[PDB]
Symmetry: D2
Subunit: 462 residues, 4 copies
């Protein structure tokens, strides 16, 4: 027998080898046992098992579950999958006779779909926990360094000075939206296929709504062919995982560049890096995060390509649904606490960041801006700024060092009050609308992040 | 600027589609400047006048991008100057930024675009629901592995293609909540130093909220990746429908006859539209894989790579805007050969399963239920009849529990009726299912409108 | 090292496959040191015997990674030091660098891997050729758009799946040429400062040449992306063959019967067969396209030189190979054991008056203008439908009534056998051509395995 | 044909680039018909002159597609008939077939396109070589993990981006041999029954050989996939160079200064070309992934899904045609800040490695060589000096093996000079490597021609 399908003789060596999934699907075991208990209650509530038969199966399953859990029951070298292994194990405990009675009204197709969903619902919550740990590490670094100012980058060129905290937090928001995506995903994942049978619906008079409720689902499927055939929930999980990986790679890239000798923004901790003197530390975790995001994009693209153009209903190609998702989850289970530890382990050189923030006359922008809100038109504000730069460049000073003689000599509009934005402190203070980098704003942002995170966590718990 | 740099950075051949939104953004900004007290009641009106002149000329086709123009914004500023002069039109340049503009404009576009895609998806759902409703009684082989398992209602099968599409609309609805956050007021990356109100501006421009972090608002493109994901998902779902139609339409199956206006071509008809749907779904997977690859490992904040956000998303939308009405029309146009499907539904003794499951229901242990069923096939093979054509004694000779009452499931009508739990193929369940699709579709439509 | 860092960087669960290659690189590095005069004859022989001992225990699986080993290389260093002491073992570390070693081992591994894949491909091609040779004269409908077009030889359809596979073998040959460049001697980035000879080392290790640039040699992975690509291409070609088989094996088509040992049947009907292998092929082609796309995404935008990201080059390529090593013999056995229902196929070949085309082509060949020829073919079809008859059963009086040009000579193409025989240019389905084609495939295959051997 | 079908099948907005090849095929076919004795000399020459005139009108823009033209082939049938009339026009339809012709045009177009890309690739390699030849002495930090490792010649780093591009050129050469097989004469699927010579036609059209199987020739698109891969591989190689340039030009590295004509812009210059290169490599990866997804699981022979082969490859080519001259120019325009690079090259006591390695060369066991270098660093860090400034006494204190001769590797120049095996950064090896790049590039160029 192979996947409950039958042979006059037996499968060829090469087919037996191709069919095997026990080296990755064993993590489905506990869910499979759960489903079996529920199917026992189904056959009972359908008057298909006596009280002792039901008790006989339930004790069989408990024993089996204990043995699976302690690692003393495993697959033989001949089981194609966890389902065949578990059937064999139950029959060992309860006899061909009683074990066989459980097989009645069972189909592999709705079973496999349901178990994958149950496992996914736990997996996205483990991933959610890792995401929250990274948001947490970012938010605690932001709270620990609420006044450091660094050059804000666009195209890796210095633009406006920003709070380091504001930059850190900018990495948390995509992570919060990924949690929001996990919440939205869970509602679609929470639909049970049990009762769908092979494709056409169960002919035992079972109740798909009750079984759903038994297993943690929020509802039962509306269409048995769809329930057994479709894998868009796996595709959606794969997308959310790739998205998380991509968001981590963006942070990973910052840390990598921040860590270079030339930037010197951060010093890596010895426990969270590898590796000329002790001054040479490699951001290996950040580099792995970068590389693994590629892999998770690949899992997603492969999964979609596997789903494409498949006719209804169940096909054996759908055996390929699990490994890419399992891989994505496993990588993120490794990556998320490594990245959270990395972020938390970081030491920032704020003197280095403060000396770079105003380089190449970036505050000229703040000058021009200041002038615009006096009432100077854009062209004149920007001519005056260019001039003040030229002046400071020829005099070899910073824009702030310019005397009032010179300020007035560039434009009568340039009151000495402009100096309040000609320092990095002052520049950053001016940016005080919602989302801006001013201290008052970033403090409220960090707070809103704590709330959204607790709100998202509570939405997942249900 | 070198010719090569200029050639590489021209975007007008795809971004012109953003022109209506830029004008709307320009109107809002005129208001921002006025409320900031940087425009007189008079200046404001001149600018608002000029933007309507530019708008009408844009919707006319009379104002167009010049080969000289780098992008849509350049063209429109030039076009504004040529309606209010360098003095006034230049006053608008005050307190504005490319980085937040571009993110905002794309989100506004996408929010219109997912609604057009939503409309097309609803068309395909209605087409499938209509064909299901028009075929209350047609029964077909239910396939796994392209092999006949249980008989199903054609309606049940068609509806199985409507449900993924409804989940896609549900995805669009969830996507729209994240898309509806405005970056306007973020400036280049650090936040505006005017005293504007991003909240007011968000409401003006049609968003539900303003962004919480100016760096994030200008650097992130995950809304674009999520859009690309939904489009790729819709296309993958259409490709499964496309594959069914292609196979059904083959000479050997003959389940459907294609309409001459919806095929090409003796009585040889090609399912061209379904073929294109299959092929295009790969292209949409590609757009998505490419876009995530583009976003990967970019440092903050804005980088010019993020300009590569627009084209794969534009392409996916444009493809679906063609594919959805064509698929909807292909589905509505099919003629199902109901007699052909009905004669195939019980072939290869598929009803042996229904016999085995009837026995299980009677109390018979699973292993002997199957032996009986296999034995029943054997008896019928020898005789060359079908299962229901077995005499009572023959039946009893296979098992005592095999009473004459088993015949209620040995026709395809009987088989299909026995599957009457939620989601099953029984006419009564399928009628409720069909009805619930309509209600689900109206609920999702109403959510997008709001 | 934190627990999270160590879990993240552990590769021994996949990289163990490089162990025998690492051992080979150690024997070669031993020689390098001896040739530079950094080892005595006795030390050299103690290291070589230490490595032989370790090769034995690796080969019998008695030596294995510890939970504590970062990767295969660390494990092998530990194992050697266990067998020759810290004293001697330490001497081998001299002049050693991880960056060039890792690139070299992966390339050595790939060169063996593509050769196992090529063998797998040659078996599928052999299974297709054997089936073609076994049915030299069976005719089937030719499909475009899953619609019956011109009749073709079954053999011509089967061989059509052999050609992309021969192109994939040709690509393995091209790939091998670029893969056979040794990075050994490039050090961490900048080149070795020992006086070692990279070209000597290359040859010890079975390479054809040594890298021209130390930074490129350590940092580049376009050789792994090319392998991944060739693997995806093979899987895509298999998937097209798989799709044919899936459709052919349906009830409605009934072109093939699946062999009992190569497909699952129904619980009740062991002989009502699902084409599981073909479906898994189709499904696995997605996975291999994803391996490729991911790997290229991994390589994208990496600054030079080496970065830890490049460690991610291995697993997608290992996965692709592993999948094909399972799939290729599955597919070969599946194709070799198919039963073709040649009678069903020949009854369907002239379905829907497909032979009307051959009639139109015949007229155009006599000088009849295109549009006239088709008007004539459509008339022959209507006459034939109206009279419940096949085109060839229209009498001379009826043919001549459609057109004076339609002489009884036209009947040479109103038979499927005659339709097939008229398509006799190179690449056509005529039996003479197909027989030559079948000969050339065998010679092309022999040519390609000779090329791999070198 | 319905509106939705018409809009979906319409290919003229991207297939127009195939017109010159379609006309070439039409000339070839006029000759086939002539050799089959279905054209008189005068009919042949009327068509050839018709085709020449149409070709000229196509080249100058005076003949274009109408909204009504399904595809390029239909637009050209229209235009031919306008020029030579319906009657001579219609003789050309005889014996021709869409499926073998579309595969042929695409191949012909690809083989020209890979040559244009190759020319772009040679330009970047040329720009890299020229910058390397212009810097025979500049030394920089060699990076791993973006951390300073061994000093390397700047030329050695620059040439490291040339080698992947030569391998891509080599991939193009290999690709071209497979692309160079003609499918013309395969008919729709089964072979032509016209008694034509496919080898003669192949020569006419510019191919090296004719297909061996009509079904494969008309169905298979692995040549498109292979081209897509080479293009994505070039884009990926460009993105690594782009990434280097983006990092080098940040204020913090200061390794290069950008040229005003090759960047956008206080005195802040953005490396836009480099950023666009990086973002477009994602797009090209996506084109490849999508195309392979389109090809996956397609039954033989021709299916309309295969029309989707073209746009991903056209896009890939178009993008590389803009990017390559822009990257070549960008590289040629850089100013390298050699003093900044030289000052960073020894930083963090990276020469400790060279010290240790020198000790190993002497005979010192690896672990001792290392503890010695660790000691030397400690000594110099306390004193605030470079390794080179440690006196003969303090060197002998650390180790008797550590004689004054060691100072030959404690300058960056000395460090770099010791790396003198093939492929190493020693000035004499790099000069040989540069010369070999010229030879390889010319050898490859020649393989591509004719």
């Amino acid at each position: 027998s192979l996947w409950g399908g039958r042979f006059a003789g037996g499968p060829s060596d090469a087919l037996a080898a191709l069919s095997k999934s026990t080296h990755f699907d064993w993590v489905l075991a506990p869910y499979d046992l759960t489903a079996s208990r529920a199917h026992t209650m189904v056959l009972f509530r359908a008057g298909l098992l006596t009280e002792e038969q039901r008790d006989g199966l339930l004790a069989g399953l408990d024993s089996l579950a204990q043995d699976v859990a302690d690692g003393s029951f495993g697959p033989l070298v001949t089981d194609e999958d966890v389902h065949a292994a578990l059937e064999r194990g139950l029959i060992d405990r309860v006899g061909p006779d009683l074990g066989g009675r459980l097989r009645a009204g069972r189909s592999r197709n709705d079973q496999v779909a349901a178990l994958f969903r149950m496992w996914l619902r736990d997996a996205v919550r483990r991933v959610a926990t890792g995401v929250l740990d990274v948001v947490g590490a970012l938010a605690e670094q932001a709270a620990a360094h609420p006044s450091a100012i660094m050059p804000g980058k666009t195209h890796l060129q210095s633009a406006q000075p920003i709070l380091l905290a504001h930059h850190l937090l900018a990495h948390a928001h995509p992570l919060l939206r990924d949690l929001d995506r996990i919440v939205d995903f869970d509602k679609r994942a929470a639909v049970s296929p049990y009762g769908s049978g092979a494709l056409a619906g169960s002919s035992l008079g079972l109740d798909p709504d009750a079984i759903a409720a038994d297993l943690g689902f929020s509802a039962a499927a509306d269409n048995s062919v769809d329930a057994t055939a479709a894998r868009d929930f796996a595709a959606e999980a794969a997308f959310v995982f790739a998205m998380i990986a991509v968001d981590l790679s963006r942070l990973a890239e910052d840390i990598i560049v921040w860590s270079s000798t030339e930037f010197g923004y951060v010093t890596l901790h010895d426990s969270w890096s590898t590796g000329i003197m002790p001054q040479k530390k490699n951001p290996d975790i950040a580099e792995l995060a970068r590389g693994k995001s590629g892999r998770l994009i690949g899992n997603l693209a492969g999964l979609l390509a596997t789903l494409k153009a498949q006719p209804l209903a169940y096909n054996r190609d759908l055996q390929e649904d699990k490994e890419p998702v399992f891989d994505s989850v496993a990588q993120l289970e490794l990556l998320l606490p490594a990245m959270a530890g990395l972020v938390a382990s970081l030491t920032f050189n704020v003197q280095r960041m403060a000396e770079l923030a105003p380089a190449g006359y970036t505050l000229a922008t703040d000058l021009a801006e200041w002038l615009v809100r006096q009432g100077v038109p854009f062209r004149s504000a920007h001519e005056a700024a260019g001039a003040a730069v030229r002046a400071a460049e020829q005099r070899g000073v910073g824009l702030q060092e310019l005397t009032d003689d010179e300020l007035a000599a560039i434009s009568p509009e340039l009151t000495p009050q402009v100096r309040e934005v000609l320092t990095i402190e002052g520049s950053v203070s001016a940016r005080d609308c919602r989302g801006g980098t001013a201290p008052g704003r970033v403090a409220e942002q960090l707070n809103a992040i704590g709330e959204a995170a607790e709100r998202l966590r509570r939405q997942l718990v249900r």
